[PDB]
Design an enzyme around this catalytic site. Structure first.
Site, PDB file in Angstrom:
ATOM      1  N   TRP B 130      13.084  -5.281   8.338  1.00  0.00           N
ATOM      2  CA  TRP B 130      12.438  -6.105   9.581  1.00  0.00           C
ATOM      3  C   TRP B 130      11.063  -6.688   9.443  1.00  0.00           C
ATOM      4  O   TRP B 130      10.761  -6.740   8.293  1.00  0.00           O
ATOM      5  CB  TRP B 130      11.315  -4.933  10.285  1.00  0.00           C
ATOM      6  N   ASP B 211       7.870   3.637   6.765  1.00  0.00           N
ATOM      7  CA  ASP B 211       7.525   2.908   7.896  1.00  0.00           C
ATOM      8  C   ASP B 211       8.782   3.187   9.126  1.00  0.00           C
ATOM      9  O   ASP B 211      10.071   3.461   8.816  1.00  0.00           O
ATOM     10  CB  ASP B 211       8.417   0.926   7.583  1.00  0.00           C
ATOM     11  N   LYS B 246       8.281   1.554  20.562  1.00  0.00           N
ATOM     12  CA  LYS B 246       9.125   2.209  20.843  1.00  0.00           C
ATOM     13  C   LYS B 246       9.550   3.292  21.750  1.00  0.00           C
ATOM     14  O   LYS B 246      10.260   3.268  22.999  1.00  0.00           O
ATOM     15  CB  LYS B 246      10.052   1.634  20.304  1.00  0.00           C
TER      16      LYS B 246
HETATM   17  C1  LIG Z   1       8.676  -2.384  15.810  1.00  0.00           C
HETATM   18  C2  LIG Z   1       8.866  -1.665  14.208  1.00  0.00           C
HETATM   19  C3  LIG Z   1       7.159  -2.152  13.374  1.00  0.00           C
HETATM   20  C4  LIG Z   1       6.040  -2.042  14.194  1.00  0.00           C
HETATM   21  O1  LIG Z   1       5.496  -2.377  15.022  1.00  0.00           O
HETATM   22  P1  LIG Z   1       4.509  -2.692  16.325  1.00  0.00           P
HETATM   23  O2  LIG Z   1       5.338  -3.495  17.679  1.00  0.00           O
HETATM   24  O3  LIG Z   1       3.382  -3.469  15.822  1.00  0.00           O
HETATM   25  O4  LIG Z   1       4.108  -0.857  16.776  1.00  0.00           O
HETATM   26  C5  LIG Z   1       7.423  -1.600  12.271  1.00  0.00           C
HETATM   27  N1  LIG Z   1       8.353  -1.340  11.543  1.00  0.00           N
HETATM   28  C6  LIG Z   1       9.679  -1.525  12.376  1.00  0.00           C
HETATM   29  C7  LIG Z   1      11.369  -1.699  11.549  1.00  0.00           C
HETATM   30  C8  LIG Z   1       9.604  -1.898  13.344  1.00  0.00           C
HETATM   31  O5  LIG Z   1      11.286  -1.563  14.124  1.00  0.00           O
END
Ligand SMILES: *Cc1c(COP(=O)(O)O)cnc(C)c1O
Ligand SMILES: *Cc1c(COP(=O)(O)O)cnc(C)c1O
Lengths: 396, 396
Positions: B130, B211, B246
């Site tokens: 990400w 994460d 999510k």
């Molecule tokens: C969505 C996501 C995040 C966290 O994002 P927030 O929108 O700040 O909650 C962190 N790592 C990954 C791989 C993600 O998909």
């Protein structure tokens, strides 16, 4: 990897929170609260915000992400509040507002932005100033220096020492100003002093950074903004970190804004993008709820009407308590002159009590205050004022 | 002070957002959405969260600040979800959870904490991973290095290159793992591979950083946590950055957590305090609303029941679309094998399209996807699947 991690220091105020909430004495008063309380000794949720919330509840259809800079209506409402409805900054579009998680969030994103994108290395903070300032800037790598401000004797703004110490500051140094209701003193430059400060500021090449967490708590929404506007009329560049934490009683929804002001739209847009990249490397995009509540209230005539009434009710109660305080002390009697109390604005002011005095006040009476003698006026009620003053008198 | 400020780069995905929303062609499909969408092509607010919100609306009596680490019930519910209801980490109380503004906030507070309190200087991130990862760590001063992960040919987890590149990492280096639903690939280590990784990790002295933004999107809430638990059983120390963005459809309420795990309570408390000081130098305390919604749902049997049903409904739709995708392509026909699509988990996976192919897909058909060929499966509906595949076939 963490075995030799040295513990973080006892929070300079929160210790009182816990300590206080451990006193079986129910005549106890916590004056170190740092938050507004009504005559019930409660930090309620405004009627206007509750209405704003039923509205959001009935109308929200997605919790999808906000842009890095938050809800747009929120940005425009804040710059109108700050610079005034017809301001040139707004029309010339030289101001960009990013919604942030409280005023502290606004201060850290400024710090990060300034540290990665400019040559600023030191930030001038008043002595005294709201505590968390140092940590925020240092954490971004900015060195913090302090300028003179408070006159212990006269309990007043020592303008001379102020402008005298600011002279060590070089061009390009950031100088931090509380827009109104200076914390922890309650002493604000008068409009003329704001104007001379603006002028010296332009001459020396300071980058002003306004911390504006108490708009509406001194005289009113527009009056409170005059100092900042005095600077905004004078400067090509400035940064303002506003908080709605207090004037909207939205402490925990973390609603604030970091507004950037540059010479023209073109440079403000260019600088703002880097401020956006700084937001994206931190928390990504801001919390919609609190900001959403603010934006619907401020944009709705009926709701804004109720809020303003609520804000003035708060402003006035604080004024009543300072007033009731000063003469209840003059009733319980002691060689004093806490009259400077009535000339100070906002929730805080230095009572002028020594650390030993505050100590026995806590231990011997159950009145909790910060070691610096700082006292939160909103912690006083017509009902706890008498014992408060008796304790105060018994230790003088 | 800002005239020579260089503009921040065009957001690596957001550009598509704007570009797409400028196509008068309404047969257009945006597969670069990065967020979940239902078969209506909407990112709704869960029924369970709306109920949680009417509840908060009717029961909240103050918006007063939360502690640096947020609502406590929120912390315990998250560590139960992560480590399981009876976990030893929980009973031995060696885990501390701080509520944060989304998973990105959790990642930045970890970064800041690790950078100011430990000797870690580099963070190993998978290639690919990400995006925002690099900025977060670099902004805290940690150097980011990448370990191998994805096998372009087999569209699979190149475990060998993985464990081979991780060997450059020294003891004390932080190694970042996606707990489930790896982004952007959709390939997750199998439980055995998670176990060997844990073992190598302990041997080399890596500090694992998980994460975990998609819990419940791969197989289920508990299954998805097995890799992390495989590590948690093995390690004295680990850090987990979870997001509810999510799985609760709370994108904009910024709800996440940074959980610290140390050898014993005593060291976790000591390390956590410094993590708290890192939170206080950033945004002070977290946004209550989103976290409040999560805590009431997860703590209420009836509400948690509805949510889980909602989560599985989401999980299943994503599974249906990958499935429907793979065979609608085999219906529109082309020398292909998008069968790896069905073996991938979560919303994303690399379609395997070249940058030129994605380009003409956008320009010539109105299908928007990331240049890397990354595709968001939740952007597909039974209704837009046919044209989608036709376009896909027309460019192969
Ligand atoms: C969505 C996501 C995040 C966290 O994002 P927030 O929108 O700040 O909650 C962190 N790592 C990954 C791989 C993600 O998909
Ligand atoms: C309250 C306050 C802040 C902002 O705090 P938030 O609670 O983060 O909104 C900043 N500066 C001063 C002087 C304050 O009083």
């Amino acid at each position: 990897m963490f075995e030799n991690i040295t513990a973080a220091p006892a929070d300079p105020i929160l210790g009182l929170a816990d300590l206080f909430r451990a006193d079986e004495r129910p005549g106890k008063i916590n004056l170190g609260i740092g938050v507004y309380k009504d005559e019930t000794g409660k930090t309620p949720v405004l009627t206007s915000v509750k209405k704003a919330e039923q509205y959001l509840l009935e109308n929200e259809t997605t919790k999808n992400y906000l842009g890095i800079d938050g809800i747009p209506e929120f940005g425009r409402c804040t710059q109108e509040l700050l610079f005034g409805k017809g301001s040139a900054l707004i029309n010339d579009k030289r101001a960009r507002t990013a919604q942030t998680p409280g005023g502290t969030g606004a201060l850290r994103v400024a710090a990060d932005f300034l540290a990665k994108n400019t040559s600023v290395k030191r930030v001038w903070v008043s002595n005294p100033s709201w505590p968390n300032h140092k940590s925020v800037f240092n954490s971004a790598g900015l060195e913090v220096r302090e300028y003179a401000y408070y006159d212990a004797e006269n309990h007043t703004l020592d303008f001379d020492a102020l402008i005298n110490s600011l002279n060590e500051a070089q061009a390009g140094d950031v100088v931090l100003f509380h827009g109104c209701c200076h914390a922890p003193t309650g002493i604000d430059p008068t409009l003329e002093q704001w104007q001379t400060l603006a002028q010296l500021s332009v001459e020396k090449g300071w980058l002003p950074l306004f911390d504006f967490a108490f708009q509406g708590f001194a005289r009113g929404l527009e009056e409170d903004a005059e100092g900042l506007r005095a600077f905004a009329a004078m400067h090509k560049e400035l940064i303002v970190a506003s908080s709605y934490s207090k004037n909207f009683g939205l402490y925990n929804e973390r609603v604030g804004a970091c507004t950037l002001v540059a010479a023209d739209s073109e440079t403000v847009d260019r600088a703002f993008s880097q401020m956006k990249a700084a937001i994206r490397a931190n928390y990504s995009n801001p919390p919609a709820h609190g900001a959403s509540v603010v934006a619907t209230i401020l944009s709705n005539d009926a709701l804004r009407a109720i809020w303003e009434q609520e804000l003035t009710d708060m402003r006035q109660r604080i004024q009543r308590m300072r007033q009731l305080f000063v003469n209840t002390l003059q009733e319980k009697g002691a060689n004093r002159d806490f009259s400077f109390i009535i000339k100070q604005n906002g929730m805080f002011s230095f009572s002028g009590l020594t650390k030993e005095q505050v100590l026995r006040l806590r231990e011997e009476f159950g009145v909790y205050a910060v070691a610096s003698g700082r006292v939160n006026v909103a912690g006083m009620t017509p009902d706890n004022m008498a014992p408060l003053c008796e304790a105060i008198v018994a230790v003088l």
